[PDB]
Structure formats: structure tokens, C-alpha cells
Amino acid sequence: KVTLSATGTITTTPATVDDCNKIVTFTPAKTLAATSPCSVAGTTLTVNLDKATPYAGTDAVNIAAANSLAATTNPLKAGSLAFVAKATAVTIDPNLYTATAIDSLVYEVALPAASSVGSTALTAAQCGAILSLTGGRTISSTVTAPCVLDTTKTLLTVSLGTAYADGDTVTLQSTQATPWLRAASDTGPAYKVGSTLIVKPTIASAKATTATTIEVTLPVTSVIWSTSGGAAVSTALTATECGKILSVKRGSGTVALSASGACSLSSSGSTTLTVTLASDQVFQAGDKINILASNTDSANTDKYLVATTSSSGQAYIARSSDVVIAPGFINAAYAVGPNTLSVALPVVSSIATDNDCSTVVTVRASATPTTTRTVSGA
């Protein structure tokens, strides 16, 4: 987005690629998108780049020198004058991209390019001056690294002190601090305040409790709502309807859900959503699950997964990484010796060499929960 000093217009719209190369130039050079490469509305011009040449973090933009010459042109002009090129190009200020609630006490924020927060990991106080959470909320007072970046330095994870609730938003503060957030280097451009973001809900986790049951966990209370087929919450779905909301993956294929009663979720509000598999399929290690993009398509998906006990809340969107399901059940327990046991594990399994087995199992008496037996050795 390039701000302008005066109201701007493009003579005929939409412009093409060829026109736009005569309207904006990049340093380093870029290739513009094949559809809607530039457009103007008031004092702002949006330029859509190609996915093969994205924003880098040390880039500058300027009015192309050819924008104000010749007669075979479609220049961007304010009133009747064509825009002129500044003596010095302008540096592009990155802005926050998305916010998401991957948990009831954790967020996740995306970035337009690689970035940096300094040479050391912040604390709650330092990151309280960077991010402004609109509500009466707090940052974690117990997490040692409440603000942190991932390996590629494109995602920022925040930890909260009070539960996230629908209606939350995030935006950077107005006054700068010592570390602040920058782009592409410790001495790169600083981030700026701008479009207040809205936090969208997504999946939190998922475990398999039987060979054919799965239980997803939601960051907040949610119901499944119907728009026109009904007018309110649902009660039970099929493979087709609960297959335009999410899917269960396995390698390159997909697992077949139940022909009926595939999706269940309360009408008064629940945090667990149950998915049932087909009678002839079973859960195995390495299975994944995610919310599909079709859940947000109101023109088609009549029944869809939404937060709060109403349709005025936000819908559910795909996670940045497919959630892998955790085994949550065991087959049987045997006493293969006076002091040795053997437990059937439903799937492929492994274990570390230096583990303390007292954190893997627990032996006790079914008659009252007292009188545990001592588990020793790896």
C-alpha cells in the first residue's frame, strides 16, 4: 500500500501488467501479478505482486519515471497532473498480517517476511510495550519467553494471562521501545501501527480415544450453525456435510468418515467436537486433521463451525500446520512375570533410551486408588 499526497485516479480500470510497469518501479526489481496488479481508491494505491517475487524486507518503491511522458500511456494522475518521481525512493514499512487463537491462552501472529526482535528473548514487560491487546487483558507472568519467533522468523507466538474470548484484537503500540520489531535484520526497517487485526479461532489439538473416535479441542465455546437449510444450531451430520468443514488426512489420501452421525457438537455450547470414522477404517499413527477453507464459504456450506453460541461470532480457519492426532488408548495389560508386564499398543511406537518409566504409566489397585506399585527402570 502506497499512500499519496493527493487524491489519485487511473484513467481506465482495471489496469494491466503493461500499464502497471509504467506506474510503479521496485528496487530490487519485481514481476507483477497477472490479475489486478494495481488500483487506486482515494489517497491509497494497492499493488499486488507475483508469488514468485515477494516482499523481502529491505525494499523500496517509487513512482516510475515513465509515468509522466509520451502519449501512449495510462498514467496515474491527481486531477490532471501526472505523479512525479521523488528524488529519494521510499522504504516499505512492514505491518502485522494475521492473528489467531491456537489455544485459550495462546495466540499466533504471521508476518510478511523474515524479521527479528533483538539479540535476546524478551520478558512480559518488554513485550507489553510492543503489542497492544485492545481488551483488559494481560501477557503471561509465568512463561519465561512470552514472546518468541519460529525458525523461519515469520510467526510470533504470544502467551496470555487471561482466557481469549471472541472479540479480541491485536495491534502494535504507538511509542517505540528499545528492541521493537524489525524486518530482515537486527538493523532493518521498523514495524508500524496500522489495520487493527481480528483473532480467528482454529483447532487446538486432537486425540483418538478408540479405533474409530476422535476428539478435537476448541480454543473457545462453539456451536455448529446452519444458515438457510435451517436457521440455528445443528445436532448431527453425515460424511458429506462434516466433510465440507474438516478432513482427516493420511499421507496423500483421506480417511472415510461415518455415513451418518459423523460430526457431533452441543447446541448449548461445547469445547469438544467428536468425529467418527467409517466402520471399516481405524486410526493409525501419523494421521492429521485440519479445518478446511470451505468452512468459510457461506454460499455453499450451509452448516459450519463457528465460535460463541451464535452466528455473530467468527468461523474456523485452517491451521498453519496440520494437527497430528495423539494416541489416547491402550489395548490390554498382561502380567508376563511376577515383576514384568506387557501392554499392547494400538499403533507403531517408540521410546527414548534415558526415559524414566514412572512418567509413562501408573500401576494401582482398582479397589480404591491407593497402593500404587513401584515402576522402575527405562
Cβ neighbors of 152 (< 8 A, separation 6 or more) are 114
Closest CA to 71 of 82, 79, 85: 82
- 358 has which bridge partners? none
Omega of the bond leading into 327 within 30 degrees of 0 (cis): no
Q: Which helix (H) or strand (E) holds 27?
A: strand 24-27
Closest CA to 170 of 144, 140, 200, 203: 200
Cell of 10: 487511473
Cell of 368: 480404591
* Experimental technique: cryo-EM
Strand 60-63 versus strand 303-307 pairing type = unpaired
Q: Which helix (H) or strand (E) holds 224?
A: strand 213-226
How distant, in Å, are the alpha carbons of 3, 22, 49 from that of 32? 19, 12, 5
Per the CB < 8 A criterion, the answer to whether 127 and 139 are in contact is yes
User: How far apart (Å, rounded) are the C-alpha atoms in residues 148 and 145?
Assistant: 6
Cell of 230: 435451517
Q: What strands lie across the sheet with 60-63, from one edge to the other?
A: 24-27, 60-63, 90-91
Strand 98-103 versus strand 197-201 pairing type = parallel
- 363 has which bridge partners? 373
Q: Is the dihedral of CA 72, 74, 80, 84 positive or negative?
A: negative
User: How far apart (Å, rounded) are the C-alpha atoms in residues 83 and 265?
Assistant: 57
Q: What strands lie across the sheet with 38-40, from one edge to the other?
A: 2-3, 44-47, 38-40
User: How far apart (Å, rounded) are the C-alpha atoms in residues 322 and 216?
Assistant: 13
Cβ neighbors of 82 (< 8 A, separation 6 or more) are 67, 68, 75, 76
Per the CB < 8 A criterion, the answer to whether 192 and 73 are in contact is no
Per the CB < 8 A criterion, the answer to whether 20 and 64 are in contact is no
Task: Find the angle CA(344)-CA(347)-CA(353) to the nearest 5 degrees.
Answer: 80
Query: Alpha helices of the chain — where are they, by DSSP H?
Result: 17-20, 124-128
